[PDB]
Amino acid sequence: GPRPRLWEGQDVLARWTDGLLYLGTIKKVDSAREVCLVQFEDDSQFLVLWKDISPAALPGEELLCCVCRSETVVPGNRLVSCEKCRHAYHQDCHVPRAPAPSWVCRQCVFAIATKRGGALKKGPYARAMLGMKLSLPYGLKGLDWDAGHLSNRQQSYCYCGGPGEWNLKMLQCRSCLQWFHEACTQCLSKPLLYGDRFYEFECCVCRGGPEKVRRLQLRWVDVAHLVLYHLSVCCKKKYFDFDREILPFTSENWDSLLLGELSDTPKGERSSRLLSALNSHKDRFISGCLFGLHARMPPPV
Numbered sequence: 001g002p003r004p005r006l007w008e009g010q011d012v013l014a015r016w017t018d019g020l021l022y023l024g025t026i027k028k029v030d031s032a033r034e035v036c037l038v039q040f041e042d043d044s045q046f047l048v049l050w051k052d053i054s055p056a057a058l059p060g061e062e063l064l065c066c067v068c069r070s071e072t073v074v075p076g077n078r079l080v081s082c083e084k085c086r087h088a089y090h091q092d093c094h095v096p097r098a099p100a101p102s103w104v105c106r107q108c109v110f111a112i113a114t115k116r117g118g119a120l121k122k123g124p125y126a127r128a129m130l131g132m133k134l135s136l137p138y139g140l141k142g143l144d145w146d147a148g149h150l151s152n153r154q155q156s157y158c159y160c161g162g163p164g165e166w167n168l169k170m171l172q173c174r175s176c177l178q179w180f181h182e183a184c185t186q187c188l189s190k191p192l193l194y195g196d197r198f199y200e201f202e203c204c205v206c207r208g209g210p211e212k213v214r215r216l217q218l219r220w221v222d223v224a225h226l227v228l229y230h231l232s233v234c235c236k237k238k239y240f241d242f243d244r245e246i247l248p249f250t251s252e253n254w255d256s257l258l259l260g261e262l263s264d265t266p267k268g269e270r271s272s273r274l275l276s277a278l279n280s281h282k283d284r285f286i287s288g289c290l291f292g293l294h295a296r297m298p299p300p301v
């Protein structure tokens, strides 16, 4: 082709595994694997799939659909322009179908409403976000999953269609088994722990409406395993000091752990039950006053 969509030196927004957009520069284009090497603002460089890369709208493209690259229009399928990014779309190249020709496209609604800890809950963008989330921008049936239904080949997740790691602040839907980004959800009261599957969750698409979520009751062994796994992933190490790291994390984040029945236990006893859990389950925990996990996987539900 004579006019690639992407090229070296191009400034782009890349969607990361948290569903959020990061400013970057293309350093290498791999047309075979359809990835680019992108350098981000902290100078880190990662491969990013073409589907997750958005360059800026350029002068001269005002009449071009940014999806199918055509200016041609027919009666029931007009061009609509986004007020925020200034890209244009055929009504039918947008998901969901865009209204007849002020309007904001799906990517911009997500860019405005997604937030670490959970998306905006209130206001016009929260409602627009909810409306976008009734539909997926990829086919669920066509995905190829590994045995545990944890990752797919396409790297298509969530309402956004971005990449993702199931153990890194994502929730799985009961009904479709797809995984969804914390940042793209609107139902959480607290940010997710890494690897935390102690929820019942049903997505907007399956419900045809707002998400539904329930935090399951944890046992003390679950608390210990969750905290230790979360720390392992956060800190990228194996062994943690109980007094300098484990217990302080648990104390300082107590209300955010959503511990249900356990949340009322006397403050002077919490250390005892936590440490007892760590000492008693040798199948889960390696002891050193340090503790680590065997083979580093999230707590089983």
Ligand SMILES: [Zn+2]
Residues within 6 Å of the ligand: 018, 019, 157, 158, 159, 160, 161, 162, 180, 181, 183, 184
């Ligand atoms: Zn997402």
Ligand SMILES: [Zn+2]
Residues within 6 Å of the ligand: 065, 066, 067, 068, 069, 070, 089, 090, 093
């Ligand atoms: Zn189009």
Ligand SMILES: [Zn+2]
Residues within 6 Å of the ligand: 082, 083, 084, 085, 086, 087, 104, 105, 106, 107, 108, 109
């Ligand atoms: Zn837009």
Ligand SMILES: [Zn+2]
Residues within 6 Å of the ligand: 173, 174, 175, 176, 177, 178, 202, 203, 204, 205, 206, 207
């Ligand atoms: Zn679902």
